[PDB]
UniProtKB/Swiss-Prot annotation:
Has a stimulatory effect on the ATPase activity of HSP70 in a dose-dependent and time-dependent manner and hence acts as a co-chaperone of HSP70. Plays an indispensable role in the organization of KRT8/KRT18 filaments. Acts as an endogenous molecular chaperone for neuronal proteins including huntingtin. Suppresses aggregation and toxicity of polyglutamine-containing, aggregation-prone proteins. Also reduces cellular toxicity and caspase-3 activity. Widely expressed. Highest levels in testis and brain, and lower levels in heart, spleen, intestine, ovary, placenta, lung, kidney, pancreas, thymus, prostate, skeletal muscle, liver and leukocytes. In testis, expressed in germ cells in the earlier stages of differentiation pathway as well as in spermatids. In brain, expressed at a higher level in hippocampus and thalamus and a lower level in amygdala, substantia nigra, corpus callosum and caudate nucleus. It comes from the Eukaryota. It is linked to Muscular dystrophy, limb-girdle, autosomal dominant 1: An autosomal dominant myopathy characterized by adult onset of proximal muscle weakness, beginning in the hip girdle region and later progressing to the shoulder girdle region. This is DnaJ homolog subfamily B member 6. Transmembrane segments: none annotated. The chain holds residues 188 to 230 of 326 of the full protein. It is found in: Cytoplasm, Perinuclear region; Nucleus; Cytoplasm, Myofibril, Sarcomere, Z line. The gene is DNAJB6. Disulfide bonds: none annotated. Homooligomer. Interacts with BAG3, HSPB8 and STUB1. Interacts with ALKBH1. Interacts with HSP70, KRT18 and PTTG. It comes from Homo sapiens.
Amino acid sequence: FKSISASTKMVNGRKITTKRIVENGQERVEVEEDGQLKSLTINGKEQLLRLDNK
């Protein structure tokens, strides 16, 4: 099931908020930078594409 977890941290006037969502073994991460998200990872594993089949 999807787990709705989140955390905040106002450091040096910098409200950092991380959105943890665990569903099907996928914990998404959304760190808030200056009130603006700029991070997106899953279980600490950035994903995008793989042009090289190898």
